[PDB]
Amino acid sequence: GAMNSSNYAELFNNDIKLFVDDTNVYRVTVHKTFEGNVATKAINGCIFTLNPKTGHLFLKIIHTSVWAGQKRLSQLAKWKTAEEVSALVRSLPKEEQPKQIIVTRKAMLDPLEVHMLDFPNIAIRPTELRLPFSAAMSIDKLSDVVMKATEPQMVLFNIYDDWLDRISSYTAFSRLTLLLRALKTNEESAKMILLSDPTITIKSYHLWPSFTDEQWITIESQMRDLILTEYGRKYNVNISALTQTEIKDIILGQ
Amino acid sequence: MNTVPFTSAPIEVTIGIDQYSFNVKENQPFHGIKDIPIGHVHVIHFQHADNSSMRYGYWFDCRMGNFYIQYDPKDGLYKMMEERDGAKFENIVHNFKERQMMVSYPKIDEDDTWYNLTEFVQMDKIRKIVRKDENQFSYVDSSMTTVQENELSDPAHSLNYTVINFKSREAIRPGHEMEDFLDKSYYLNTVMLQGIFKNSSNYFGELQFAFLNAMFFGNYGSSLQWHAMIELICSSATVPKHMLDKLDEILYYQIKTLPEQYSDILLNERVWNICLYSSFQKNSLHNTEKIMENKYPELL
Ligand SMILES: CCCS(=O)(=O)Nc1cc(N)c(F)cc1F
Ligand SMILES: CCCS(=O)(=O)Nc1cc(N)c(F)cc1F
Numbered sequence A: 001g002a003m004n005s006s007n008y009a010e011l012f013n014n015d016i017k018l019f020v021d022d023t024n025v026y027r028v029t030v031h032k033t034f035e036g037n038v039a040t041k042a043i044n045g046c047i048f049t050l051n052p053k054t055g056h057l058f059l060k061i062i063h064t065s066v067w068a069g070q071k072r073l074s075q076l077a078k079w080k081t082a083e084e085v086s087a088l089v090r091s092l093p094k095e096e097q098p099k100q101i102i103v104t105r106k107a108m109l110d111p112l113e114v115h116m117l118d119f120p121n122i123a124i125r126p127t128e129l130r131l132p133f134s135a136a137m138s139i140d141k142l143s144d145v146v147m148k149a150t151e152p153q154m155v156l157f158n159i160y161d162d163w164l165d166r167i168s169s170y171t172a173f174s175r176l177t178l179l180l181r182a183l184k185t186n187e188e189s190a191k192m193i194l195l196s197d198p199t200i201t202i203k204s205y206h207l208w209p210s211f212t213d214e215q216w217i218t219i220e221s222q223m224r225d226l227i228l229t230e231y232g233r234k235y236n237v238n239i240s241a242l243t244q245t246e247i248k249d250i251i252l253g254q
Numbered sequence B: 001m002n003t004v005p006f007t008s009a010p011i012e013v014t015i016g017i018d019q020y021s022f023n024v025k026e027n028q029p030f031h032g033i034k035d036i037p038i039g040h041v042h043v044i045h046f047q048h049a050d051n052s053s054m055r056y057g058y059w060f061d062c063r064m065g066n067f068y069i070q071y072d073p074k075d076g077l078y079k080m081m082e083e084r085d086g087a088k089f090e091n092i093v094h095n096f097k098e099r100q101m102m103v104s105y106p107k108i109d110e111d112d113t114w115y116n117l118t119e120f121v122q123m124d125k126i127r128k129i130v131r132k133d134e135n136q137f138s139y140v141d142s143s144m145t146t147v148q149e150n151e152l153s154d155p156a157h158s159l160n161y162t163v164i165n166f167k168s169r170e171a172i173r174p175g176h177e178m179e180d181f182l183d184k185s186y187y188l189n190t191v192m193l194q195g196i197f198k199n200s201s202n203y204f205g206e207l208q209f210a211f212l213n214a215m216f217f218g219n220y221g222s223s224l225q226w227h228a229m230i231e232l233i234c235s236s237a238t239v240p241k242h243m244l245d246k247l248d249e250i251l252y253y254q255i256k257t258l259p260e261q262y263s264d265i266l267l268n269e270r271v272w273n274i275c276l277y278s279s280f281q282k283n284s285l286h287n288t289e290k291i292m293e294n295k296y297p298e299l300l
């Protein structure tokens, strides 16, 4: 059934699974018309399809041309997401096909189940986790490839860079969710923490800076404080009075 | 006007004949039901006074043979049986009528209720849903499962309703996933009407039969089938005008007849709300919407 805190280790077992996040598929700027009415202008989006065990990201770029002359775009966006995920599964060799697909939003369940009727053995599951995958478009290299696209395109990344050489997929996923949670809560501050030190660069074939193990501890601490600092600024709470059990819970709680 | 005699009534039982019912006491001199209108299917049904889970009955058509009821003390139920000797049957019925030991099918002359509930229901279609080819009448009870229910156990004692599944390959053409899921017109018109039922009369026949099994036996799988067949029409943007007008009449009489006190178990909130207020046909069921709003406004 539903993926939650109880069944969290299941993400890092040896059954192939993908997360699908459709938050950034349909993206608009809202603006005034000359007549003082309101109109939307679509911009390029993306489907965020992630193997949490390997870090393999299947970033399907959604070009604004997809929407031309279509109606009910927020509803079409779910069905186009399900169509592209289905096309991706059919493109993979049998031994690479996922055994489960976890959708970050419950509205994706019916569209994906209907597109995957050909795959009765693939379980389509919701999650109770509030995952910060919407902040994918705060990763500069992912934002850059989406915005420059002139046509529909699939681009493949490893969202963990080379981290799995040194840490487990459990830890890699925790680091990824903490970074994305921070980018989602205060993008400018998160980016400032990651890119402050000119000596630490991002390899051409990476998304994140080349932090040593010790530097990752400092970074992760600075990200936790940012999330705490913003939860304090948001709710008008003195974050000085907070205990370590109080702090732990508000980050997970999120 | 035809007659379903009884051998006796050895156990106290509520006897239903179509929408009517009466209490018979243990060993009361009851010898059956006379003046049953020719031209319609009928259902005789039973609920034992000492055990209310014993709820069961027989669909029959008096044009198809001479039927009587006899209690079987081994199997502990009232059984329908066919008498093939015409002259014997007529002689038995004549005796019971002369001694006035039969209740009269109590049809009000103005009253089209039973016609309106069974307009499309045919015995030959019932016998394909309920398979027991050695009998001309069909046994149903409260616990019989549907073929669909048995997929999600005994196959000989099942209700063979047409399987309807909105998230099935039958319902969804490859390449038309969103179209076919949001507008069920393809599934209704090509797969079900043209493909399986051949015409709207057979579709309405099965819908009316499902309703009646739900109401008379509290058969849960029949209730699921009745709602699935309603939702398939209401979820289709393209339905022939005659079918919508007829559906409105069918549902009106079903909702009219439903005992007020069973509404909570026999009506699905989600389906009715969707069908009357959200669906393509939300403005097409005037009679049904008015009786539902006036009789069951809590459900909505
Ligand atoms: C050749 C894939 C390079 S990668 O983007 O760095 N990693 C990767 C990414 C995806 N999506 C994959 F299926 C397999 C991979 F190895
Ligand atoms: C899922 C984010 C993991 S984390 O960066 O280690 N956050 C975290 C940090 C601390 N100190 C803790 F006690 C519990 C936590 F979950």
Ligand SMILES: CCCS(=O)(=O)Nc1cc(N)c(F)cc1F
Pocket (backbone or CB within 6 Å): B005, B006, B007, B008, B068, B083, B088, B089, B092
């Ligand atoms: C008195 C003899 C008939 S009986 O045993 O009561 N029951 C009965 C028996 C037969 N065969 C019938 F066609 C109709 C009946 F009512």
